[PDB]
Amino acid sequence: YSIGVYDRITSATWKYRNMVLPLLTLPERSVFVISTMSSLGFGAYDRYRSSDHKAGKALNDFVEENARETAKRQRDHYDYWYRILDEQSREKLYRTILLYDAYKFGDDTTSGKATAEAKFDSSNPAMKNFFGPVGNKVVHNQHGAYATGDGVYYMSYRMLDKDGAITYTHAMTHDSDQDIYLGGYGRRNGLGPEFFAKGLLQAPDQPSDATITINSILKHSKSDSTEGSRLQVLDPTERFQNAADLQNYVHNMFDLIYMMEYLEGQSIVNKLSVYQKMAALRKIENKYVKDPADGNEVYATNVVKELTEAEARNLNSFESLIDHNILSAREYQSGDYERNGYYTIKLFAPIYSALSSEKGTPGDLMGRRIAYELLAAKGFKDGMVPYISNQYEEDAKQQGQTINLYGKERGLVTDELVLKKVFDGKYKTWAEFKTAMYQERVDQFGNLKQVTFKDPTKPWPSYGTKTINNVDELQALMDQAVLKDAEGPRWSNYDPEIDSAVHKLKRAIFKAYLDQTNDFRSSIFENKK
């Protein structure tokens, strides 16, 4: 329980306990120790010395303040994760795992973060007096960060920079997702370690990122220019006080997302030609491939393909979009996806698809989407943990559905079992669940909607407001924007991104609604809407 360093390194079952004697003898302040709840980071001052920061008062000032800020950010992150978990597994968020820095020290002549890996004979005081005495030969490749399971190592992302915490949350999720973030049960048999991290359970890479994430670390006030295109949570420790607050936040966010997606879908089937509908949409399916780890081929990988013309003409019904498993091509590539890949779902790119594997594992692109939707229906306990944490594995084995894992008979948690257990009487097929969510959202925004929506959707000369008051004007704007993308659809650059007008309108509406209230609390304007 102690946050004190000596009570951590001194304590038994520590990977590098001997790190106390070099630390007590360090001649000068050449190493920093960020000892927060559940982490014991060790860094060198020479890691941040460059041309901009010179050895002396400047380096000591840049490191001390940035280390204090990083400690505060990690403390806020674990405060959030402690407030969320309420299944008495929070008492296990006291493990200690070191966060060694790169060992790539930089002289005052180096322009940026130098890439000279030290060889353990380096004259740099940190290597000679501490990091070298506590030997820990690390692979030290030039770029990337990896979590060995018992620790975390930063090779490129500096631990003190603001981009250090966005990698810190990813590495921690890989390091402790088997008995910490989940209810206590291990990862799902099909999902890999990269599934529970980049797409879900990670802070967003950038504030203006249009991705479905939870800003649990970075606390950025409205003073910064980042307020433009915030598209995320203002304060993590303020917004999230318990699991109910997270469920409500995700519920409101997905309410707005479902409203926008239903508007775009109504724009698709009504005002769009056939040839334009071909390129505007794609079809997602699940392909089963043999994996080297396990002999069984029950695992499914998501594959995105161009839908045929025969399927395009049959997409007239909005319900059909969900049934024919079609997804928008604005942000999702046309190539086949892979398992355990750095794939995240975009915030404004609709996925009307409810594709579910009747086999054990959904995939990656479809897995994260449904999991976030389940978080809207039910909170992190129940909801998301059954979908991604195989806690219903034993039930599967008792009913049937066995799988040969490493030569032993084990339970195979299928999506059908997850659906029949989480929502036993409410739904029977994932398509029904998606349709019921859309219908609830429709009955919602048909009556109660805030008229205070301020979306410019225009060029550099400042445009003050559009003041949409009822969903009909917003649907008309969405129709006009979709028509515009179909016209002149060069798609020249590999990523159109912000250029497409449809994305501009969605981002504007999202930012307007986020700035209207303090945060995502409720998206329903209780009048004759």
């Binding site: 040839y275 060069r490 020249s492 590999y494």
Partner: protein, 210 residues
């Protein structure tokens, strides 16, 4: 540079009735190949469409466009355009509204003697006669005051911008003309007009100066 797509095409009916060469090539972009691509027209009066002459635009090689660049009897009907010289890779549909004569307008020349405080000599007079007469941008709009064609430098098909007027509004192209003092005393004023796409010429000549 970055896509698979085109740009807006300027339908070519200007060459068909206002020029000796009846070219029928509406401007198209993103086509970098030989002119063997099929041409599709909603309504065809008689003769098959003829693709326009190769030119390089936006670092794009030999770009195809769509001709019947001289079917004058069929052109008189005014049936739409919506040029679609689609490439095999590109979507087949083409669409620029240009069917039966729409929003036709008459020329409104505005030429009057102008005071020249800065030009006491009177050798050169800067007069910008008022224009109109063409609702359709893709037309061989030319000015021919008198029975003799005016200055090669001053004679061309200048582009025009639609101007904010009561009721119907028609684009006008400025026609400033520089002539010698003897020509001014000649009384050979130059008429200024704009011609609609549906009409073969659609040019009206009426001007009075000094």
């Amino acid at each position: 540079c970055c896509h698979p797509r085109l740009s807006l095409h300027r339908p070519a009916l200007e060459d068909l009735l206002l020029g000796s060469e009846a070219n029928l090539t509406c401007t198209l972009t993103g086509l970098r190949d030989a002119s063997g691509v099929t041409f599709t027209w909603t309504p065809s009066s008689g003769k098959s469409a003829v693709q326009g002459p190769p030119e390089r635009d936006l670092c794009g090689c030999y770009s195809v466009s769509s001709v019947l660049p001289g079917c004058a009897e069929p052109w008189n009907h005014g049936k739409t355009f919506t040029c679609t010289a689609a490439y095999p890779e590109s979507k087949t549909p083409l669409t620029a509204t240009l069917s039966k004569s729409g929003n036709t307008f008459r020329p409104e020349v505005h030429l009057l003697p102008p005071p020249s405080e800065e030009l006491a000599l009177n050798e050169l007079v800067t007069l910008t006669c008022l224009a109109r007469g063409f609702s359709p941008k893709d037309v061989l709009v030319r000015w021919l005051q008198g029975s003799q064609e005016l200055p090669r430098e001053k004679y061309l098909t200048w582009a025009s911008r639609q101007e904010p007027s009561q009721g119907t509004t028609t684009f006008a192209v400025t026609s400033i003309l520089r002539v010698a003092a003897e020509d001014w005393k000649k009384g050979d004023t130059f008429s200024c007009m704009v011609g609609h796409e549906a009409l073969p010429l659609a040019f009206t000549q009426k001007t009075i100066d000094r």
